[PDB]
Nucleic acid binder design. Structure first.
Ligand SMILES: [Mg+2]
Lengths: 469, 414, 51
RNA sequence: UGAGGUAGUAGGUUGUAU
DNA sequence: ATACAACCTACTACCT
């Protein structure tokens, strides 16, 4: 009968140098680190979409409550939290006609339909960015639910109503990377869930008990997209750089390729957390192989080390490479040929496939979050999802799944690796929640990869995450 | 020096906690009843004393709940008495926070005072509060968020934390206790393609370079393949299983990892055959297989008073388990739980969309205790003895029916 | 390093590129939002950067 | 595509050795 | 090209 080890919950940092575990509570009490003056919003869509967005923007300012304010904290309003203005008066409208949407919506080919709709929105975006004298921080694209339903890669258009990825969101964000415009895509049913009902006279999506959670998530995403920093890590060490590598399949070309994207996190001399991407997805011409060539591995590590040195002044002491795959010998030897003697290379594999479930004997709740089961000096299990005493509820749904964290290559302390991963799980800026399951490096590398492998014509993409997430 | 906040104690706490913490973090000394976790029996005397002798401003949270609350009205009367005594025209400040309560329905002690509008925006209300406080020279210290952080930690974060208590968790791993002493590679040579089907044999066996690898004897395969009836015991390679499991084998004839993989293959095949022997229904998933019981198998689908087959609305739900042996870190049997839906008592719904939707609809209301009890009951049903169950290997392999427990040094308090 | 090239064309191109690359990099590879970029230009650059 | 979680459906690759 | 084990990704469906 085996033993477990507990890893303390990490604390994130907020305004006035105040540490907390919950992002929502820390934002409510102290506030963001940045001082944005206000958010100027550009809205694209039909007149109904503009009305929906204006109504939601007016609704945001007033406090919003949930069914339980212990499990899910309430939203006290946008300005009361972020201390900046995001009002409906600063809205810039670029109308898209319903007739124009219907002209391209009902087409035989899903590729042609999604390309036409994506181009219809992007043409207005770029025309307003270039030929209009007003400044817009974030562009909010209100999308009718038909466009969402009928633009999926595998979606089929009913016969009665009859490169680049066949997906509205990824192709939309991939074709806007040349102009560096942060965009937030909304569905009309998200902000007006009450007005869309099913055959039984009830809404399809019920946000009655989680209205404040929706407000939290939307407001945090909008604040991050406008150039604000809501929080940052507090316990991360100096001289260590975290890398996260994700491979994606590219079906745009005739020959399948495995594009590898990365995410890089570290600490600058100003105590600010530098978290960005690592792009120019290094491809592999062999189908089914998710291992980098020596040349591409050398290029990746050289670029990462050069970026770290430029931002700091010296090469990192430690480098951690979180990947969902296992590095092989040739790729690791290629990696080691770039690192200097002072830089220690550690390659960690993070997976969620191993089926180990721990059931509490005498309760209706689940295993505590932060528990670990160190298999051996190079392998452990980490429970990043589970019961959180602070919110008196579990992040998982039925029984949480563990993360099998294994130090595949290099020498490092396994407990330190688990602590680093559990601290990374607090850096998700796409959502305003308690810490999620996967580390932020792998998740954001996946988010980058899902967009960079949509459109082929991306020479040098930006590094900021507001253009991807 | 203090600033009294009066509200409806169980109704307007979300706004009051926010306002009190915001004002405390700004240097003001705030007296609110929800800032103390230990209210004495004679707390009203303390409230009256603090109103009379301590507070310089009396903020009143005006809402529909607090409009006619008896305790709030008593506090308002005491505050009015101190206001008349102190010759302070602006002692009582109402903060209007409820949109439902019209301005024509406020109580008699408030209908004449200038209120602060928190309805449209809390930030604007706090800005107005601070502007009034600096304009009226309300005493305050230097701003410090550490006080707000400490009070939040102490008061609203005291019963929600981890504690140093021992906990025991029940897993889904089946530690394997007994293994056959030796693994045999019989040199059967061709043997008519060595029963090319292989998977249809009576015992779990695999095909190596030019040997049949299995944990059983040579003569056990005479029924399916008669060539072994004359094959002698000289043409075989016997290896010790315990030596392989300890990472001791070497040389270029065979690799240790290949030996472990072959053992895993044999164990999986044996588990499949033994589970077939139990005469249960088999479901073929996308990449695995699961075993479930029918409606009429048990009397009445309530083994160990846990229930295994039931009905959601009109279909029948059945619990099922899927097993897979493994040798990392120690020989165990991964066991995964699943639910299957049948339109009739003993049938299957061909469409997978309805099955998936019904499974996700059902799983929303089961939770940890239900999952654990159902898994343990299903796994104890297959037990062949008091505390084990066997898989065919003459020889056989025994697996414990009690999953390995885990020990934890911390837990929570519900 | 670029201001003392003999040819005015090459000097101006190199020095404009030096000023321009940082602006573009901070536009694409940084998470701040900048309204106006105020390029403060010394006198030595200004005097020797005419046709 | 507000966001996480839990599952299911498909495909592929690698070391051996017929 | 078949059998297996041990890893890999892509694309939905439902809950709150
Ligand atoms: Mg987003």
């Amino acid at each position: 009968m085996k033993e477990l080890i507990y890893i303390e919950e990490p604390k994130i940092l907020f305004a006035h140098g105040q540490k907390c575990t919950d992002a929502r509570d820390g934002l409510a009490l102290f506030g963001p680190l940045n001082n944005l003056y206000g958010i100027k919003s550009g809205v694209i869509g039909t007149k109904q979409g503009l009305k929906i967005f204006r109504d939601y923007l007016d609704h945001i300012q007033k406090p919003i409550y949930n069914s339980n304010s212990i499990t899910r904290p309430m939203f006290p309003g946008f300005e009361a939290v972020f201390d900046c203005k995001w009002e409906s008066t600063g809205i810039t409208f670029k109308e898209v006609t319903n007739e124009d949407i219907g002209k391209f919506l009902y087409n035989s080919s899903t590729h042609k339909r999604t390309y036409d709709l994506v181009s219809l929105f992007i043409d207005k975006i770029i025309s307003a960015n270039k030929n209009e004298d007003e400044n817009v921080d974030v562009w909010f694209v209100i999308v009718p639910d038909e466009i969402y339903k009928y633009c999926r890669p595998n979606s089929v258009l009913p016969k009665e109503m009859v490169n680049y990825d066949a997906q509205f969101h990824d192709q939309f964000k991939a074709r806007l990377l040349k102009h560096t415009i942060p965009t937030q895509i909304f569905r009309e049913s998200t902000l007006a869930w009450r007005d869309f009902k099913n055959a039984f006279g009830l809404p399809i999506r019920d946000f009655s008990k989680i209205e404040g959670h929706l407000a939290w998530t939307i407001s945090t995403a909008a604040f991050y997209k406008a150039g604000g920093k809501p929080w940052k890590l507090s316990d991360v060490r100096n001289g260590v750089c975290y890398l996260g590598l994700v491979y994606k399949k590219v079906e745009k070309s005739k020959n399948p390729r495995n594009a590898c994207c990365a995410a890089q996190m570290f600490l600058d001399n100003g105590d600010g957390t530098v978290f960005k991407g690592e792009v120019g997805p290094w491809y592999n011409p062999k189908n089914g192989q998710y291992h980098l060539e020596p040349k591409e591995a050398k290029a990746l590590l050289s670029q990462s080390l050069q970026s770290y040195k430029e931002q700091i002044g010296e090469y990192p002491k430690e480098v951690f490479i979180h990947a969902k795959t296992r590095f092989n010998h040739q790729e690791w030897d290629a990696f080691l040929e770039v690192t200097p003697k002072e830089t220690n290379l550690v390659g960690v594999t993070i997976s969620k496939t191993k089926p180990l479930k721990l059931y509490k004997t005498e309760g209706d709740y689940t295993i505590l979050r932060g528990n670990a089961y160190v298999v051996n000096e190079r392998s452990a299990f980490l429970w990043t999802v589970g019961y959180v005493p602070k919110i008196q509820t579990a992040l998982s749904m039925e029984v949480p799944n563990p993360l099998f964290i294994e130090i595949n290559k290099g020498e490092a302390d396994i407990k330190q690796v688990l602590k680093d991963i559990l601290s990374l799980t607090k850096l998700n800026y796409n959502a305003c929640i308690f810490a999620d399951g996967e580390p932020v490096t792998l998740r954001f590398a996946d988010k980058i990869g899902e967009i960079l492998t949509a459109s082929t014509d991306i020479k040098t993409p930006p590094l900021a995450f507001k253009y991807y997430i | 020096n203090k600033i009294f906040i009066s509200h409806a104690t169980p109704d307007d706490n979300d706004f009051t906690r926010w306002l009190a913490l915001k004002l405390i973090g700004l240097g003001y000394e705030v007296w609110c009843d929800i800032l103390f976790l230990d209210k004495g029996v004679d707390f009203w005397s303390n409230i009256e004393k603090v109103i009379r002798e301590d507070t310089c401003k009396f903020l009143l949270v005006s809402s529909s709940y607090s409009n006619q609350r008896e305790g709030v009205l008593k506090e308002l009367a005491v505050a009015a008495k101190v206001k008349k005594q102190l010759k302070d025209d602006k002692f009582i400040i109402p903060l209007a926070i409820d949109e439902q309560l019209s301005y024509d329905d406020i109580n008699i002690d408030i209908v004449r005072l200038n209120a602060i509008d928190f309805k449209m925006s809390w930030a604007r209300g706090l800005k107005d509060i601070l502007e009034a406080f600096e304009k009226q020279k309300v005493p305050k210290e230097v701003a410090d968020a550490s006080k707000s952080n400490l009070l939040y930690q102490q008061i609203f974060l005291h019963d929600k934390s981890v504690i140093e208590k021992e906990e025991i968790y029940d897993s889904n791993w089946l530690s394997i206790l007994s293994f056959p002493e030796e693994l045999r590679f019989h040199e059967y040579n061709w043997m008519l393609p060595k029963r090319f089907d292989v998977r249809e044999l009576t015992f779990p066996a695999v095909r190596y370079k030019n040997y049949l690898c299995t944990f059983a004897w040579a003569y056990d395969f005479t029924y399916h393949l008669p060539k072994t009836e004359t094959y002698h015991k000289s043409k075989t390679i016997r290896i010790p299983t315990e030596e392989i499991l300890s990472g001791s084998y070497d040389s270029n004839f065979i690799r240790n990892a290949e030996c472990k993989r072959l053992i895993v293959q044999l164990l999986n095949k044996a588990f499949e055959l033994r589970m077939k022997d139990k005469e249960v229904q088999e479901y073929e998933m996308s990449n695995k297989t699961a075993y479930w019981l029918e409606k009429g198998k048990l009397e009445k689908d309530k083994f160990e008073k846990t229930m295994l087959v039931g009905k959601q609305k009109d279909k029948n739900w059945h619990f099922a388990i899927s097993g897979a042996s493994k040798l990392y870190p120690f020989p165990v049997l991964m066991i995964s739980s699943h639910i299957f839906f049948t339109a009739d008592g003993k049938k299957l719904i061909d469409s997978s969309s309805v099955q998936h939707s019904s499974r996700r609809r059902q799983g929303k209301n089961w939770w940890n205790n239900t999952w654990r009890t159902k898994l343990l009951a299903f796994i104890k049903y297959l037990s062949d003895d008091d505390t084990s169950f066997y898989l065919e290997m003459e020889e056989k392999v025994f697996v414990s029916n009690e999953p390995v427990k885990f020990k934890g040094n911390v837990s929570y308090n519900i």
